[PDB]
Structures are given as C-alpha cells and as structure tokens.
Enzyme design. Structure first.
Site, PDB file in Angstrom:
ATOM      1  N   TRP A 160       0.901  -1.162   0.000  1.00  0.00           N
ATOM      2  CA  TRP A 160       0.000   0.000   0.000  1.00  0.00           C
ATOM      3  C   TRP A 160       0.939   1.210   0.000  1.00  0.00           C
ATOM      4  CZ3 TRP A 160      -2.296   2.899   4.714  1.00  0.00           C
ATOM      5  CH2 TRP A 160      -3.368   3.722   4.287  1.00  0.00           C
ATOM      6  N   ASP A 180      -1.364  -5.382   9.029  1.00  0.00           N
ATOM      7  CA  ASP A 180      -2.293  -4.377   8.494  1.00  0.00           C
ATOM      8  C   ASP A 180      -3.420  -5.274   7.963  1.00  0.00           C
ATOM      9  OD1 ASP A 180      -3.757  -2.383   7.171  1.00  0.00           O
ATOM     10  OD2 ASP A 180      -1.999  -1.450   6.281  1.00  0.00           O
ATOM     11  N   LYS A 188     -13.686  -1.004   4.587  1.00  0.00           N
ATOM     12  CA  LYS A 188     -14.087  -1.787   3.445  1.00  0.00           C
ATOM     13  C   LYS A 188     -15.109  -2.882   3.738  1.00  0.00           C
ATOM     14  CE  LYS A 188      -9.750  -0.095   2.050  1.00  0.00           C
ATOM     15  NZ  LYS A 188      -8.318  -0.268   2.396  1.00  0.00           N
TER      16      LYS A 188
HETATM   17  C1  LIG Z   1      -7.550   0.554   3.076  1.00  0.00           C
HETATM   18  C2  LIG Z   1      -6.229   0.094   3.738  1.00  0.00           C
HETATM   19  C3  LIG Z   1      -5.748   0.640   4.927  1.00  0.00           C
HETATM   20  C4  LIG Z   1      -6.513   1.667   5.743  1.00  0.00           C
HETATM   21  O1  LIG Z   1      -7.545   2.354   5.324  1.00  0.00           O
HETATM   22  P1  LIG Z   1      -8.458   3.279   6.314  1.00  0.00           P
HETATM   23  O2  LIG Z   1      -9.411   3.767   5.201  1.00  0.00           O
HETATM   24  O3  LIG Z   1      -7.577   4.186   6.930  1.00  0.00           O
HETATM   25  O4  LIG Z   1      -9.330   2.406   7.193  1.00  0.00           O
HETATM   26  C5  LIG Z   1      -4.615   0.175   5.450  1.00  0.00           C
HETATM   27  N1  LIG Z   1      -3.978  -0.803   4.810  1.00  0.00           N
HETATM   28  C6  LIG Z   1      -4.425  -1.355   3.672  1.00  0.00           C
HETATM   29  C7  LIG Z   1      -3.612  -2.501   3.042  1.00  0.00           C
HETATM   30  C8  LIG Z   1      -5.551  -0.907   3.112  1.00  0.00           C
HETATM   31  O5  LIG Z   1      -6.017  -1.461   1.941  1.00  0.00           O
END
Ligand SMILES: *Cc1c(COP(=O)(O)O)cnc(C)c1O
Ligand SMILES: *Cc1c(COP(=O)(O)O)cnc(C)c1O
Lengths: 396, 396
Positions: free
Chosen positions: B130, B211, B246
C-alpha cells in the site's frame, strides 16, 4: 519488546474521569472535564443536532471517503464563523481549511505541518494553559516555552509580565493564543490588549497559532472572534485550530478544523498541499458524521436559529451557576472572597485551591476538580451547589 | 514563514480521485481508489448500517467524550473477530485494543507508540505494498526497508526471495504483514507459508505488525484471519491495525482498531497506558459514530446476520467481475494471458500494465488506474466491462 515499558502517568484531565467512575459513593460531584451539563446534570445531544442527524439518515447515499481536507461546505462555514462573512481572507482566497478529528487533531496537524515544512522549533504557550498543549507539540518534535499570563494574587491578566516574557520569543517562533474563554483561567485580554498583541507579533516576527475551542461561550459568536480578527487584519500568516466539540455538544464525534492563512492564494495552496500530506500520513481523511452535522446546521436557516439559541442557553446557564457558586460560598462560610469568579468567561473557574485541597475534596468528599484548582462551573447545578460548597469551605 | 514551502507531490491513490473529478468526459471509468461499487456503479451505505444508524438516532442520550481507547464493546468485538471467540489471548487478557480513526489512524498510533516507547528504528514493508505505509512510518521517525514479495514474471509470491530478503532483518525489527487480500497484488501466502513465517519471526526476534483491512473479502471472516492466528498462537507480542472501512462500507466514518498483545496482562496494560498517551497527543479520543455502528451490528444477531450476507454479496460480486474481466479481455483481442487475475484475492488486480500504459489509458481513454498497474475490480460492472477492456487492449 514491551517488557521495560513504563506506565504513563495518568492524564490530569482524562484520568480523573476514570477515578470518578471507580468511585462507589452516592453524592460524588464531577467538576473535572470540560463538558457542559444542563440543570439536571445530563449532557444531552442538542435538538438541532438530533434534527440534522435525522436528515443525514434520510439523505445519505454513500459512506464513500471524503477528501483529505473533508467536506468543502464545512470548511467554508468555518471560515465565515472565524473571520466574518465578507472577510478579505475569504474574498482573496488567502485561507484553506482541513476538517480534523476535533481541535486536538487540528493542533496536531498544525504541529506536524510546522515541524516538517518550516523552520519552527519553538512554540510559546501561556502559563497556565490546557494541559495537553505541551504534549501535542512535544509529539511533533517542537519544544514548548512558557509565557507569563495569570496573576494569581489579583486573579487578573498580568499583561506587562505577558509582554516581557514574550520578549524572549524570536522571529520565526510560534506563539499560541487562546481564542476567548482562556482554558483554564477564564481570564482574557480586552480588545485593546488584543490589538497591542497583534502589532507586537507582526513586529517581532511571530507566527500566531490560535486554539479556538469555545467560540460562543463568552459573549457570542461574532464577539468571541474579536481578538482573532484583530490579528487576521494585520497578519499575512496564521493558523487556527478550532473545535466544535463544546459549542455543538459534539464531543465524541470529533469535529474540528485547522485553517491555514498565507499572504496570497498561490502560497496558501502550495502550503496546503503539505498540510494534506501530513493528514494522509496520520489518519488519512476525516470522519464525516459530526462535520456533516455541523455543515447541515450551519447551512440551514431554521436549524441554525435553533442551535444558536441552544448555545445561548448553555452560555446563560453557566453564567447563572457562577453567580450561584460565589453567593453560596458566602452563605456557607467561605471566608475568602471568591467574587473574581464572576469575572471569568467560559465553563471554567480557576478556584485558587491548592493541590492538597483538591486532593482532600475528592478523597474525603468525592468532589472532583483538576489538580490545578480548575473547576467546571457548567458541571454545577442548583441541586449539587450546596453539598459542593460545603465540601469546599471545609478544606479551606 | 510559508514562502518557500514546496508543493507536495499528489498522493498516488487519492490525487487520482481529483483528476477523475476534473474530467469532463462522459464514459470515464474509475478503477483507482479501493472503494466497492455495486452492479450499478454506486457505493451504497449498507442496509445493516442504515438500520444501526436509525437505532443510534433513537437511542443515544449523549455525545459526551468516549475514553481515549473508545467503546469497550467495540474493542471486545474486534478481538473476537481477529483472534477467535475462545481465544487464549482473550481469556488470558493479553490483548488491549484502542478504537482509532480508520486503519491508517491505527498504523499511525502504532508507529508513534513504537517510536517513543521501544528500541525500534526499522519497519519492513513488502515490495510492493500500500503506497501510504512508507509515509506513515516515516512520519513517526522510523525507516522503511523493503522485502521481496512478488514475482512479476510468474505473477506469484516469490517465497524464497521473501525469506532471503527478510534475513537482513535484525532482532527487534518490525516486520509488517498484510492480513489477507494483499494490497496491491492480491497474492497471499498459503497457511503453510504463514506457519513458516510465524516460526521464522519468533526465531529471528521480529515484532509482527499486521495491516488487516480486508477481513472477509477473500474466503470469509474466520478464514481470512488464519495467517494472523497462526502468528498469535506462537508470538508473545504483536500489534494489529485493522480497518472496518471496506468490510462495513464505512469509509468516511473512520473506523479501525489498533490492538496490542504482550506476554501477559500486566505487561500489555502497562504498554497500553503509553499507547493511550500517544493517542491523547494526536486526536485525543476516537469518533463514536462509525464504531458504535460496528459495535451495534456485531452485538445484535439479526443485524449481524444481515451484514455478513452483505459482505458475502460484495465478495461474490468482485469474484464474478474478475472472471468477466479475463474473459472479456480474451474476447476483445488482449493477446496476453490475464488469467493470473482469477487467482488474486480482494478488490485489486495487479494488471502488469506499465506506467506509460496507465498514463495512456487515462489520458486517451479516461480509464483511471493507479500508476503501479493496480486496478479496482470492484469498480467494474458489466456495463463498463466492454469499453474498459477495449481501452486496455488498445494500449497493449
Ligand atoms: C484501506 C487500507 C488501509 C486503511 O484504510 P483506512 O481507510 O484508513 O481504514 C490500510 N492498509 C491497507 C492494506 C488498506 O487497503
Ligand atoms: C477542548 C479544547 C481543545 C480541543 O478539544 P477537542 O475535544 O479535541 O475538540 C483544545 N483547546 C482547548 C483550550 C480546549 O478547551
């Protein structure tokens, strides 16, 4: 990895709420955290916000991510609340605002921004000040220096001491000013003093950072913004971290703003791109709920009319409680003149109680105040006024 | 003060949304940000969350501040989702969780905590990962090192390279693992590979940081937590930053958790007091709305039943779109075998498009993907599948 981590010392304001919860006694009184209470000792969600929430529930189509800076209308409404409707900062496009998680989140965002993008290393905070200021700035890597403020003997603003203290502040230093309803003293500069301060900082090269968390609790919305506007009128740059936690009773929804003003549009925008990068690396984008509630109320005439009156009720009730407190103290045998309390603005009375008196009140009487002697007058009701005043005169 | 601030480079994922908005063309397609879309290209708020919101509107009595760590029930529900219902971490009181503003906020809180309370200086993130990981850790003062992961020729997990890369990692280093639905590749380790990784880290002295942002998008809630549980079963310490953005379609409400596990209850608690001090100096306490929505749904049997099905629908629809994408690519003359796409989990397909192909698609065809070649398969519908596949085969 975690074997030697020492326990953090409890937060002076927030750890107090834990103690109070752990307390099994019947008549405990909580004069700690700065949360408004109505005549019955409840902290209701405002009628204007319940209505906006119903509207949100009916009208939201998606929970899709806001931009890093939030709801545009929220930002526009903030600028008008802070600077005035036909403001030059607004018309010249000199200001940019990011919606943040509360005022604390705005102070943090400002700290990180200044730490990673400017030559700032020192932030000046008053003595005394909100206990969490030092902690937010220290987190970003800035050091906190103190300027004189309150005269404890006279319970007044020691302006000359303020000025002389501030003379150690260099060009390029950040000086933090509270909007109005100074936390924790309730002592604020007159407008003349604010203009004096505004010319002084422009002359010494300081960057003003305003913590505005009680707009509307002293005299009114437009009136409480006087010092800040006096400043805005002559400074090319400034940042304001505002909160809607107290004036909208939106405490747990985390609603605040960090607005950045520069000399012109091009500069503020370039500077804002860095503020946004700082937000992205912290919490990404802000929570929509509380801020769309604020945007909805502020944008709707009927809903705004209702909110302004609710804010007028909060303010007046606190004023009634201050008076009740000083009168009852007199009737209860407090042989000290607590009338200076009538002269403070906001939810807080800096009582002038010693750390041991504060310890005895909570330990022997279950009355809870911050160790500094700061008491929440908004937490006082006519039902608890008597036992509270009896507890106080007994530790005096 | 702000005259020489340079403009930050636009965010690779988030600045893409701005370009797309600024786009005046009719058939533009947005395959950028990781936001789910239904068959009609909308991102509705879930029926289960609308119901919980109605309940909140009827039942909330106050907006008074939550604790620094949030809603207790939210934390309890997270632990059970992550570790299992009758988990030993749960029964031994080895874990503590703080509700945070999204997963990003949890990663940040973890970073600040590690930076100010442990001897960590290095965080290992996969290549690719990410894009915002580097940025969050760099903000806390930690440096980011990369470990091998994806084999671009074979479109597989290059496990030996992963292992050998990780051999440069020292005892005391943080190694970041993604839960499941690796962002951006969709390539994840088998459970055997997860156990191999778990024994290796316990042996090399690494602190795992997971994560977890897509729990439930690969096979199911309990199934997607396998790698993390394999780890939890043998590590005395670990931190997990989870997101409900999500899996609950709660993107803008900022709902996430940072859970900290230590060897025993006394240690995790002492360690948690420092995590809380870190939160207090950032945003103070978390936003209630999204998290009470999650707590309400998770605590109510009917409401949970409905949500799990909505999550089952999201997952299956994406799976249907992957297939549609590879088939249509074949029918449209994409002479390259894109079938590896069928093997990826989550919302993202790492297409293997060059930065220039990605530039041409958006510039000549208005199709928007991240410069890395990452495409949002959840952003695909049967209505946009054809023009999108025609655009792609034309830049190949
Ligand atoms: C979407 C995501 C996040 C965090 O997203 P938030 O919208 O801050 O909840 C962190 N890591 C990964 C791999 C993601 O896809
Ligand atoms: C309440 C307060 C803040 C911020 O509070 P949030 O709850 O984070 O909105 C900041 N400064 C002062 C002086 C305050 O009283």
């Amino acid at each position: 990895m975690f074997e030697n981590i020492t326990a953090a010392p409890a937060d002076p304001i927030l750890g107090l709420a834990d103690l109070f919860r752990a307390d099994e006694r019947p008549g405990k009184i909580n004069l700690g955290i700065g949360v408004y209470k109505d005549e019955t000792g409840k902290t209701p969600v405002l009628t204007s916000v319940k209505k906006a929430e119903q509207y949100l529930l009916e009208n939201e189509t998606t929970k899709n991510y806001l931009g890093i800076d939030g709801i545009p209308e929220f930002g526009r409404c903030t600028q008008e609340l802070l600077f005035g409707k036909g403001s030059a900062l607004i018309n010249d496009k000199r200001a940019r605002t990011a919606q943040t998680p509360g005022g604390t989140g705005a102070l943090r965002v400002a700290a990180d921004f200044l730490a990673k993008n400017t030559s700032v290393k020192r932030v000046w905070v008053s003595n005394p000040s909100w206990p969490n200021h030092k902690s937010v700035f220290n987190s970003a890597g800035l050091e906190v220096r103190e300027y004189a403020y309150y005269d404890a003997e006279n319970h007044t603003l020691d302006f000359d001491a303020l000025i002389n203290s501030l003379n150690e502040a260099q060009a390029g230093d950040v000086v933090l000013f509270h909007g109005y309803c100074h936390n924790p003293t309730g002592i604020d500069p007159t407008l003349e003093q604010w203009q004096t301060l505004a010319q002084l900082s422009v002359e010494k090269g300081w960057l003003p950072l305003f913590d505005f968390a009680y707009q509307g609790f002293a005299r009114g919305l437009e009136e409480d913004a006087e010092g800040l506007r006096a400043f805005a009128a002559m400074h090319k740059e400034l940042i304001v971290a505002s909160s809607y936690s107290k004036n909208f009773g939106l405490y747990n929804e985390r609603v605040g703003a960090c607005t950045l003003v520069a000399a012109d549009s091009e500069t503020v925008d370039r500077a804002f791109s860095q503020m946004k990068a700082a937000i992205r690396a912290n919490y990404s984008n802000p929570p929509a709920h509380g801020a769309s509630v604020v945007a909805t109320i502020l944008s709707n005439d009927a809903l705004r009319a209702i909110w302004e009156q609710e804010l007028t009720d909060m303010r007046q009730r606190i004023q009634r409680m201050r008076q009740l407190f000083v009168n009852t103290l007199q009737e209860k045998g407090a042989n000290r003149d607590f009338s200076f309390i009538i002269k403070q603005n906001g939810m807080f009375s800096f009582s002038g109680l010693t750390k041991e008196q504060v310890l005895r009140l909570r330990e022997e009487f279950g009355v809870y105040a911050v160790a500094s002697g700061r008491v929440n007058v908004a937490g006082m009701t006519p039902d608890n006024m008597a036992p509270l005043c009896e507890a106080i005169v007994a530790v005096l």
